[PDB]
Enzyme design. Structure first.
Site, mmCIF file in Angstrom:
data_model
loop_
_atom_site.group_PDB
_atom_site.id
_atom_site.type_symbol
_atom_site.label_atom_id
_atom_site.label_comp_id
_atom_site.label_asym_id
_atom_site.label_seq_id
_atom_site.Cartn_x
_atom_site.Cartn_y
_atom_site.Cartn_z
ATOM 1 N N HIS A 142 -94.729 -64.386 -91.060
ATOM 2 C CA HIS A 142 -94.519 -64.514 -89.622
ATOM 3 C C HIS A 142 -95.534 -65.479 -89.007
ATOM 4 O O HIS A 142 -95.171 -66.397 -88.263
ATOM 5 C CB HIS A 142 -94.614 -63.123 -88.985
ATOM 6 C CG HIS A 142 -94.583 -63.112 -87.485
ATOM 7 N ND1 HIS A 142 -93.526 -62.593 -86.767
ATOM 8 C CD2 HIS A 142 -95.489 -63.531 -86.569
ATOM 9 C CE1 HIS A 142 -93.780 -62.704 -85.473
ATOM 10 N NE2 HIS A 142 -94.969 -63.265 -85.327
ATOM 11 N N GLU A 143 -96.818 -65.278 -89.298
ATOM 12 C CA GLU A 143 -97.848 -66.122 -88.699
ATOM 13 C C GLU A 143 -97.761 -67.560 -89.191
ATOM 14 O O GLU A 143 -97.911 -68.500 -88.402
ATOM 15 C CB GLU A 143 -99.232 -65.549 -88.993
ATOM 16 C CG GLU A 143 -99.422 -64.111 -88.517
ATOM 17 C CD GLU A 143 -99.153 -63.904 -87.040
ATOM 18 O OE1 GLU A 143 -99.069 -64.889 -86.266
ATOM 19 O OE2 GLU A 143 -99.065 -62.724 -86.638
ATOM 20 N N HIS A 146 -95.190 -69.543 -87.381
ATOM 21 C CA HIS A 146 -95.616 -70.125 -86.111
ATOM 22 C C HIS A 146 -96.150 -71.539 -86.307
ATOM 23 O O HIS A 146 -95.932 -72.416 -85.462
ATOM 24 C CB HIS A 146 -96.677 -69.254 -85.451
ATOM 25 C CG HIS A 146 -96.120 -68.057 -84.738
ATOM 26 N ND1 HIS A 146 -95.101 -68.155 -83.814
ATOM 27 C CD2 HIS A 146 -96.463 -66.747 -84.782
ATOM 28 C CE1 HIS A 146 -94.826 -66.953 -83.337
ATOM 29 N NE2 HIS A 146 -95.649 -66.085 -83.898
ATOM 30 N N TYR A 157 -94.676 -70.886 -75.768
ATOM 31 C CA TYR A 157 -94.848 -69.452 -75.998
ATOM 32 C C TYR A 157 -94.752 -68.669 -74.686
ATOM 33 O O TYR A 157 -95.673 -67.971 -74.263
ATOM 34 C CB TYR A 157 -96.172 -69.193 -76.703
ATOM 35 C CG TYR A 157 -96.177 -67.926 -77.511
ATOM 36 C CD1 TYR A 157 -95.337 -67.774 -78.606
ATOM 37 C CD2 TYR A 157 -97.020 -66.872 -77.184
ATOM 38 C CE1 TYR A 157 -95.338 -66.621 -79.352
ATOM 39 C CE2 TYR A 157 -97.024 -65.706 -77.927
ATOM 40 C CZ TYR A 157 -96.181 -65.589 -79.012
ATOM 41 O OH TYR A 157 -96.173 -64.442 -79.767
ATOM 42 N N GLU A 166 -90.922 -66.320 -81.373
ATOM 43 C CA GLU A 166 -91.221 -65.046 -82.020
ATOM 44 C C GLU A 166 -90.128 -64.643 -82.999
ATOM 45 O O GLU A 166 -90.412 -64.174 -84.105
ATOM 46 C CB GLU A 166 -91.399 -63.952 -80.965
ATOM 47 C CG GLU A 166 -92.836 -63.738 -80.544
ATOM 48 C CD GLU A 166 -93.720 -63.429 -81.720
ATOM 49 O OE1 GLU A 166 -93.386 -62.507 -82.496
ATOM 50 O OE2 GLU A 166 -94.726 -64.130 -81.882
ATOM 51 N N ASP A 226 -96.462 -59.738 -71.526
ATOM 52 C CA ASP A 226 -96.177 -60.283 -72.856
ATOM 53 C C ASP A 226 -95.654 -61.718 -72.774
ATOM 54 O O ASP A 226 -94.736 -62.102 -73.498
ATOM 55 C CB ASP A 226 -95.187 -59.368 -73.581
ATOM 56 C CG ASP A 226 -94.976 -59.739 -75.038
ATOM 57 O OD1 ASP A 226 -95.909 -60.256 -75.698
ATOM 58 O OD2 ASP A 226 -93.860 -59.487 -75.528
ATOM 59 N N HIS A 231 -92.332 -60.948 -77.371
ATOM 60 C CA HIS A 231 -92.162 -59.992 -78.464
ATOM 61 C C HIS A 231 -91.107 -58.942 -78.164
ATOM 62 O O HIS A 231 -90.839 -58.087 -79.011
ATOM 63 C CB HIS A 231 -93.477 -59.270 -78.781
ATOM 64 C CG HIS A 231 -94.569 -60.182 -79.231
ATOM 65 N ND1 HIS A 231 -95.563 -60.621 -78.383
ATOM 66 C CD2 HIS A 231 -94.830 -60.734 -80.439
ATOM 67 C CE1 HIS A 231 -96.377 -61.426 -79.046
ATOM 68 N NE2 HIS A 231 -95.957 -61.505 -80.297
#
Ligand SMILES: N[C@@H](CCCC[NH3+])C(=O)O
Ligand SMILES: CC(C)C[C@H](N)C(=O)O
Ligand SMILES: [Ca+2]
Ligand SMILES: [Ca+2]
Ligand SMILES: [Ca+2]
Ligand SMILES: [Ca+2]
Ligand code: NA
Ligand SMILES: [Zn+2]
Ligand SMILES: [Zn+2]
Length: 316
Positions: A142-143, A146, A157, A166, A226, A231
């Site tokens: 996931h990271e 990005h 974002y 996301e 958020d 998310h």
């Protein structure tokens, strides 16, 4: 650093033994020279200064409890590199074999992980909500996804573009988890989330509502929390991606599943050829439709399924 390539052995967060590519120069460093321009893993030593120190070990054995988050950050960065190279012909996150850098032991009791524009960063968790977050292959992937997004579409974002950002990370995080083929699923973070509770995670792609996230555009969050729900509203896109791959009937709309490999191809092409920094959900639908058309033709089942999936989640 300059040295000779070596192979260490250690245990990850979940107690699994694995080999890791290291580099020897007085110490054995977590520096994998076998992939691109290297994968480098650092010790933040419970501080927030980054990256910290390149991980050094005296004997090339990484079996201490303190070692385990670094073993997994290093190893799963390699798996993710392999996924993008072998499946999408993409060399690291920038497509030009950029060095992949990760820091573990970030801060104290830190229940998160992130890409900071330059590197991956992993907390150890507080032992109750999370154990060290690099133990989750879907978290690592996931990271790192990005980074891919930031070098390609560049989705801002915030608001709908941020929710796409996301969702893309959840999608490819999950596809890497399936690629590695160890307890794969459509949930996010289950391997490191709440050690006292079985079966849960941060998010579900197959049923976002399980954790309070929307599964239809009519339920989109429109407040300011958020970063405008990045998310939260990702659940709408995660559900569409789940439906494209696996099929199902959602709010009475039936979707013919076309499988994970085609899901990955369609969304990778949308990400790298069609999405832009301000793309919204409707523009993502158009990008996925045109991506599937490029690959399979306008009358294909693949295109029909993309359309049905976005219909099912209310995205026109
Ligand atoms: N990564 C998500 C989930 C929270 C991680 C645990 N606090 C976020 O930053 O909101
Ligand atoms: C995948 C999660 C554990 C971390 C991520 N930064 C959120 O969501
Ligand atoms: Ca050692
Ligand atoms: Ca799993
Ligand atoms: Ca998972
Ligand atoms: Ca749990
Ligand atoms: Na939630
Ligand atoms: Zn993310
Ligand atoms: Zn995030």
């Amino acid at each position: 650093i300059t040295g000779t390539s070596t192979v260490g052995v250690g245990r990850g967060v979940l107690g699994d033994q694995k080999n890791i590519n290291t580099t020897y120069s007085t110490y054995y460093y977590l520096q994998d020279n076998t992939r691109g321009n290297g994968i480098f893993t650092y010790d933040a030593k419970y501080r927030t200064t980054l990256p910290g120190s390149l991980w050094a070990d005296a004997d090339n054995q990484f079996f201490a409890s303190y070692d385990a988050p670094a073993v997994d950050a290093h190893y799963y960065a390699g798996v993710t590199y392999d996924y993008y190279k072998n499946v999408h012909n993409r060399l690291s996150y920038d497509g030009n074999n950029a060095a992949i850098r990760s820091s573990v032991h970030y801060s104290q009791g830190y229940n998160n992980a992130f890409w900071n524009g330059s590197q991956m960063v992993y907390g150890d968790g507080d032992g109750q909500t999370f154990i060290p977050l690099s133990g989750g292959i879907d978290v690592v992937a996931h990271e790192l996804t990005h980074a891919v997004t930031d070098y390609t579409a560049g989705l801002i974002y915030q608001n709908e573009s941020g929710a796409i950002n996301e969702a893309i990370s959840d999608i490819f995080g999950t596809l890497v988890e399936f690629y590695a083929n160890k307890n794969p699923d459509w949930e996010i973070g289950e391997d490191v989330y709440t050690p006292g509770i079985s079966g849960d995670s941060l998010r579900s792609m197959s049923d976002p509502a399980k954790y309070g996230d929307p599964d239809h555009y009519s339920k989109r969050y429109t407040g300011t929390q958020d970063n405008g729900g990045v998310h939260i509203n990702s659940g709408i896109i995660n559900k569409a991606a789940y439906l494209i791959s696996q099929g199902g009937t959602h709010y009475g709309v039936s979707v013919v599943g076309i499988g994970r490999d085609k899901l990955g191809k369609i969304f990778y092409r949308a990400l790298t050829q069609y999405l832009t920094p301000t793309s919204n959900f409707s523009q993502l639908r158009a990008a996925a439709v045109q991506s599937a058309t490029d690959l399979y033709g306008s009358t294909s089942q693949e295109v029909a399924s993309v359309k049905q999936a976005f219909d099912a989640v209310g995205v026109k």
